[PDB]
Design a protein around this ligand. Sequence first.
Ligand SMILES: *[C@@H]1O[C@H](CO)[C@@H](O[C@@H]2O[C@H](CO)[C@@H](O)[C@H](O)[C@H]2NC(C)=O)[C@H](O)[C@H]1NC(C)=O
Lengths: 49, 49
Amino acid sequence: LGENNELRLTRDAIEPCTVGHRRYFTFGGGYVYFEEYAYSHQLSRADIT
Amino acid sequence: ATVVQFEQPRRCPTRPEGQNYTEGIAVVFKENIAPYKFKATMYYKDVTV
Ligand SMILES: *[C@@H]1O[C@H](CO)[C@@H](O[C@@H]2O[C@H](CO)[C@@H](O)[C@H](O)[C@H]2NC(C)=O)[C@H](O)[C@H]1NC(C)=O
């Protein structure tokens, strides 16, 4: 998953695993939420100020 | 903890299609206040004593 619903084909986007990881990524018409490199849950636009 | 997002584009007002006009010729009449006028002839004789 790239930026703005783009599908990248080369998985060369890596990173040294870190404690405290917590990220939202644009997915579909909303977001997807990962905590500690683990799929937490998808989340639609309305639930972010 | 605190996480915000940018607002997305908006639906702009459609330009209204607009009025349609009928081309025509018009003659505007009003109430008549002029008296009917017609010429006549008077016949008489003045008398005196
Ligand atoms: C005057 O004529 C135009 C012709 O295009 C009308 O266009 C209409 O636009 C409305 C949007 O309100 C559509 O629902 C109609 O389908 C359109 N009709 C056609 C034939 O294109 C326009 O609406 C007319 N005038 C008014 C006041 O609506």
